[PDB]
Design an enzyme around this catalytic site. Structure first.
Site, mmCIF file in Angstrom:
data_model
loop_
_atom_site.group_PDB
_atom_site.id
_atom_site.type_symbol
_atom_site.label_atom_id
_atom_site.label_comp_id
_atom_site.label_asym_id
_atom_site.label_seq_id
_atom_site.Cartn_x
_atom_site.Cartn_y
_atom_site.Cartn_z
ATOM 1 N N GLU A 153 -25.155 3.930 -5.685
ATOM 2 C CA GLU A 153 -26.380 2.872 -5.814
ATOM 3 C C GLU A 153 -27.009 2.688 -6.994
ATOM 4 O OE1 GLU A 153 -29.730 4.974 -3.713
ATOM 5 O OE2 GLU A 153 -31.299 3.374 -4.131
ATOM 6 N N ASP A 175 -30.152 0.386 -8.485
ATOM 7 C CA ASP A 175 -31.376 -0.030 -8.081
ATOM 8 C C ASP A 175 -31.919 -0.942 -9.175
ATOM 9 O OD1 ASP A 175 -32.028 1.684 -5.836
ATOM 10 O OD2 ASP A 175 -32.099 3.274 -7.182
ATOM 11 N N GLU A 220 -37.478 -1.156 -7.943
ATOM 12 C CA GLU A 220 -38.113 -0.566 -7.216
ATOM 13 C C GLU A 220 -39.593 -0.558 -7.809
ATOM 14 O OE1 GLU A 220 -36.496 3.293 -5.297
ATOM 15 O OE2 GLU A 220 -35.120 3.004 -6.924
ATOM 16 N N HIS A 277 -27.463 5.091 -10.021
ATOM 17 C CA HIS A 277 -27.020 6.318 -9.405
ATOM 18 C C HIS A 277 -25.621 6.532 -9.170
ATOM 19 C CE1 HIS A 277 -31.296 7.379 -7.636
ATOM 20 N NE2 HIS A 277 -31.488 6.102 -7.864
#
Ligand SMILES: OC[C@H]1O[C@@H](S[C@H]2[C@H](O)[C@@H](O)[C@H](O)O[C@@H]2CO)[C@H](O)[C@@H](O)[C@@H]1O
Ligand SMILES: [Ca+2]
Length: 431
Positions: free
Chosen positions: A211, A213, A216, A227
């Site tokens: 993942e 991101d 956020e 991640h």
């Protein structure tokens, strides 16, 4: 999952820009938000926070007996509060209809009716505009990428005949157990209703994958985070492999924490927020560059624009303690986690080189709006853990008492996020 046949699926149109060309695409709602009913009746298989044990006495029988249905054109707005025009998408928080109330949403960008768009971010710049002005403490309007299967799982899992057309196959680096279908099967074995979410629960399996991101955020704080996992794409997990929150957090196949770049957490408190350098009261442009060299991805850079003005990323601000890094690099990740006394699971799971390989294999674009029934979004926008004040605990200006879903859903139901002008292309220079 099988697909239900009550309602023809409608993907909500959305335009974006790819390598200099306009693309007329669409988005699909995640299967977890759909009506899941008997293959022979309108009886719900899943309602509220539990499965119907008559339809679902065990996972295999549930999978045989249940189907996820379509979302028609009117239902996007009237049930989920989602609207689009041109290259603009708006997601809503609390939407009440005649019969039901929806909280949040999660959508994926399609390439065609049956396949997600696959992004290969290495050596590219990805940008979009966001309006986070209507997101208080406790909300997250997120844009991110995950290593989902292109077809949503239909080639891998023969009991998934619904596929990406019905938003199947979500995974992320949290290895979530709240997925109702994992690996083509109902995740009904070991189901426990949530303590505080009337619409959710957890099953034995979780759905893991890498993942990235991009965003956020709410009006008070923002982060971008890489991640990596030690597994190859979409991977179901059970037991300690899921790395569940609490004692098992660092024992699973994915790095739950990630290597995060969160300006406020990094000592730059005035950089983003209401009246900040980047003013969260107004729409902003978020630019992300995935720089590579002979070692693969070596830096993830961030540039903002607002009101026509280029704003470079704010550098780490712990003078004498941490170098003034201004991007995600291996050295940043190592140094910051030492300063914050955080376990470096990112490197344990492969670090920047593992992340590079993940990006090379392609990712699916996700947009979502959610509140956080586990940790009240405190990790994003408050102090976390709530009982620490060591460097890295402070994340944003919000109270440690903020963000409980029973507060935010009642007090700010009208919260929304708008994403627009999604674009990928060559890395540009910003002076
Ligand atoms: O909860 C979803 C959120 O998790 C973070 S990891 C997070 C942990 O919750 C906390 O225990 C640790 O100490 O701090 C970090 C915040 O950076 C994850 O990075 C994020 O991408 C995810 O959406
Ligand atoms: Ca340019």
């Amino acid at each position: 999952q099988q697909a239900g046949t009550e309602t023809e699926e409608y993907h909500l149109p959305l335009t974006w820009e790819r390598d200099g060309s306009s693309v007329s695409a669409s988005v699909v709602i995640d299967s977890n938000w759909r009506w899941t009913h008997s293959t022979e009746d309108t009886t719900n298989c899943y309602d509220g926070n539990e499965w119907d044990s008559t339809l679902c006495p065990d996972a295999d029988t549930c999978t045989e007996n249940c189907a996820i249905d379509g979302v028609d054109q009117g239902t996007w707005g009237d049930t989920y509060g989602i609207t689009a025009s041109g290259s603009k998408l708006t997601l809503s928080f609390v939407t009440e209809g005649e019969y039901s109330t929806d909280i949040g949403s999660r959508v994926f960008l399609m390439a065609d009716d049956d396949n997600y768009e696959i992004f290969n971010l290495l050596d590219k710049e990805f940008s979009f505009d966001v309006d986070a002005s209507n997101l208080p403490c406790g909300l997250n309007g997120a844009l991110y990428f995950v290593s989902m299967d292109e077809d949503g799982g239909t080639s891998k899992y023969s009991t998934n005949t619904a596929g990406a057309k019905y938003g199947t196959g979500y995974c992320d680096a949290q290895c979530p157990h709240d997925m109702k279908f994992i690996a083509g099967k109902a995740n009904s074995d070991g189901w426990t209703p949530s303590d505080n979410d009337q619409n959710a629960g957890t099953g034995e399996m979780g759905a893991c994958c890498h993942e990235m991101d991009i965003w956020e955020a709410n009006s008070q704080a923002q982060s971008y985070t890489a991640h990596v996992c030690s597994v190859d794409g979409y991977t179901p997990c059970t037991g300690t492999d899921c790395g569940d929150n609490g004692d098992d957090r660092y024992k699973g196949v994915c790095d739950k924490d990630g290597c995060d770049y969160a300006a406020y957490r990094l000592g730059q408190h005035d950089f983003y927020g209401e009246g900040g350098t980047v003013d969260s009261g107004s729409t902003l442009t978020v630019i992300t560059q995935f720089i590579t060299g002979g070692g693969g991805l070596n830096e993830i850079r961030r540039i903002y624009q607002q009101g026509g003005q280029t704003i470079q990323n704010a550098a780490v601000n712990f003078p004498g303690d941490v170098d003034p890094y201004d991007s995600i690099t291996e050295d940043f990740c190592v140094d910051i986690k030492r300063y914050f006394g955080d376990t470096n699971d990112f490197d344990a799971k492969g670090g920047m080189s593992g992340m590079s390989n993940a990006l090379k294999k392609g990712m699916v674009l996700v947009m979502s709006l959610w509140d956080d029934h586990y940790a009240n979004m405190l990790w994003l926008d408050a102090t976390y853990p709530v009982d620490s004040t060591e460097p890295g605990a402070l994340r944003g200006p919000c109270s440690t008492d903020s963000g409980d879903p029973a507060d935010v859903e009642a007090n700010f139901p009208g919260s929304t996020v708008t994403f627009s002008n999604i674009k990928i292309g060559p890395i540009q220079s910003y002076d």
